[PDB]
Structure formats: C-alpha cells, structure tokens
Amino acid sequence: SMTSHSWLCDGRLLCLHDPSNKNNWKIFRECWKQGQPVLVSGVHKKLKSELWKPEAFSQEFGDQDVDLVNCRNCAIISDVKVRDFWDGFEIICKRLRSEDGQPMVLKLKDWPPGEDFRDMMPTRFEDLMENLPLPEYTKRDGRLNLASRLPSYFVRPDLGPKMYNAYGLITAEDRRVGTTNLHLDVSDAVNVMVYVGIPIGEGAHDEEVLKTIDEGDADEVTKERIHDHKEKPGALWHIYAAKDAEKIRELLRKVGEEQGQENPPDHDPIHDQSWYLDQTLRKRLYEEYGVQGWAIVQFLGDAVFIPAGAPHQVHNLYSCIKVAEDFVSPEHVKHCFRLT
C-alpha cells in the first residue's frame, strides 16, 4: 500500500515517497533541523523522459569542445567533442580505450560550463525546476531559500542547476575509486538522478555491482531494494554529519603521513578533494574516531538532500546523469557566514 514515508539506514534516514505531496515539509523539517540528509523517491515519474536521454544530448550538443577526466588515475583528456563522451555512455564497444586497450571510465567535466545550464538548455531547466521536491526550500525564489536575500557577509551559491555526467565504475580494483571525491559545500543541495545507463552484452558488469553492495555497509532494506531488481541503482553515496568534519580531517592527516605525504599540521584534506574513503578507511573512521555516516544508494528518480557543511563522496555503480540545485535554508545558514 501507498504510504507518506519510510526509514532507511536503521531509522537514521527519512525516505519521502511522493515528491509533490504539499505536506512533505511537516515530516522533512525536524530531520533537516537535526543536520540529517533526506531521500525523496519518484521524481523521474514527474519529468519528460525524452529530455534526459544520452542520445538526445549527443544529437543537440555533440559538436561542443570539452575536457574529460579518467576516473581511474585523474588524467585529463583535453579538447575532445562532447559526442565522444555521450556515444559511449551505455554502448561499451563505442567507448574511448586507454593504452592497455580497455574501455575507460570517464567523467564529463564542467558541462554545461559554469552557470550556462539555463541559457543552453531552457526546456530541461523548466522541466527540472518545476518538479523539484520541497519547493519552498529548493526553488530560486522559494520562501525558505535565503540565497537571493542575504548580504555579502554570506557566501552565496552560483546560479544553477549543475549537471554531473559520468560512466559506472566496473572492476574489483575500481571499488576503491570515487566518481566525486570526499568534499563539503557551504550551501545546501538537492541532487536528482534523471537517467541510469546499464550496459547489456559486450561489457556488462552486473556481478561486481551486486558483490559491492553485498560486501559493503548498506542497510538490509537498501540491500532488499538492490535484490528486488524493479528499480535501476545509479550511485553509492557516503555522507557524514557537519559536526564530524574535523575528526575526518584528523584521520586523513594521519593516513597521509603514514603514506609518506609531507603536509603542514593545519592543511585541509577535505578542501583538497583528494581522498575517497574505501571500506578500510570507513572502518578506521568508526573504530579509531567514533564517527558513523550514512551509506545511501541513489536509484533512478531519487533526490538526495545534502546539508551545508556535511562531508560527502559519490561512487557510480552504473552510468549516471545527475542534476543538482544549491539553496540556503534557514536551518543551516551558519555554515556560509564569513565571520567567527
């Protein structure tokens, strides 16, 4: 039967079921005030599916010049056509290959560039902004979004949204690599999974996705949702409370020193965006510093709400198109203030 909501992460994560329910705020606001992330399912059912396909991006924008990132080694592939990314999104026999002859795992960097999403793709901009959940928080002019109402004493977010496009990680060795490394933002954000590409035939890797979820830190209800099939899993997130950010910095300074890095005692390994917490490092964080996080699998149409100041990282299980909007809720405005 239909219900308003359910819990994941052993009761520590709110999951809202109806993205356009006018009463969502009554359930959301207490979890949000406590500094928790929140998940909202079903946003894909609200969107125009034909606007969010890889083949349409390639057809409309394919002659644009872009840079890619090789996720496995952070090498930059400079000044190639955006069709070279999109045509290999799902069809592995069309993907760029490294020197070893293997298909690469690529991220499309800064596309659309800077604040250009609305100008480059006005129909996509409308379809997304009209269907975002918790619209009093997330719309540019929502009553609980302070972004347009704050003086220069506050760091203000860029004009959005921003698109995040990358292939899925494939191999056992790939399990320890991030799509987006551990970092934090001084604004709140909502991140929507608008498309998941699961390759079939020549380069299918469904076995190692299932091994990754079964051997990892996800909850039993999350593990249930994977094994049911039915919905397409996109990306594995780890999110940490803003209050735990300095303990995470302490662990990463200690690990950097063990690995013979030479860093000043005050350097900020979260701001550097150079680390992915693999299973070893997540267990050490819990055992040695007493810090627990939230392990979240973002399926097609799931919106992840990330609180300002919360360290987070992302690992794509399959090829993903994500679209994210920054906002400034009153609950977390302290994180962007420029004094004390």
Ligand X SMILES: Cn1nc(-c2cccs2)cc1N
Helix (H, G, I), strand (E, B) or coil at 170: coil
Q: Single out the residue of 20, 181, 274, 292 in contact with Cl ion (rule: CB under 5 A).
A: 181
CB distance 157 to 327 below 8 Å: yes
The C-alpha atoms of residue 20 and residue 14 are separated, in whole angstroms, by 16
* Parallel/antiparallel/unpaired status of strands 180-183 and 312-316: antiparallel
Give min distance, CB of 171 to Mn ion, in A.
25
Residue (25 or 289) nearer to Cl ion, CB: 25
Give the footprint of ligand X on this chain (CB under 6 A).
Answer: 198, 206, 229-233
Q: Single out the residue of 121, 169, 193, 285 in contact with Cl ion (rule: CB under 5 A).
A: 121
Q: Single out the residue of 5, 124, 225, 238 in contact with Cl ion (rule: CB under 5 A).
A: 124
Partner whose footprint covers residue 181, from ligand X, Mn ion, Cl ion, none (CB < 5 to 8 Å by kind): Cl ion
Q: Does 134 bind Cl ion (CB under 5 A)?
A: yes
Which tokens in the block code for residue 194?
A: 């608008």
Q: Does the annotation flag 205 for ligand binding?
A: no
Q: Does 221 bind Cl ion (CB under 5 A)?
A: no
Kindly give, in sequence order, each residue whose CB lies less than 8 Å from that of residue 293, ignoring residues fewer than 6 positions away: 238, 239, 240, 241, 244, 282, 285
Write the DSSP symbol of residue 283.
H
Q: Restricting to residues 181-200, name those near Mn ion by CB under 5 A.
A: 185
Give min distance, CB of 225 to Cl ion, in A.
25
Residue (34 or 49) nearer to ligand X, CB: 49
Give min distance, CB of 312 to Mn ion, in A.
6
Q: Single out the residue of 36, 58, 165, 180 in contact with Cl ion (rule: CB under 5 A).
A: 180
Residue (103 or 233) nearer to ligand X, CB: 233
DSSP letters of 105-151?
A: -EEE-SSS-TT-HHHH-HHHHHHHHTT-SSHHHHSTT-TT--GGG--
Give min distance, CB of 52 to ligand X, in A.
16
CB distance 273 to 182 below 8 Å: yes
In DSSP terms, 195 is beta-bridged to: 321
**In the complex, which residues of this chain contact Mn ion (CB under 5 A)?**
185
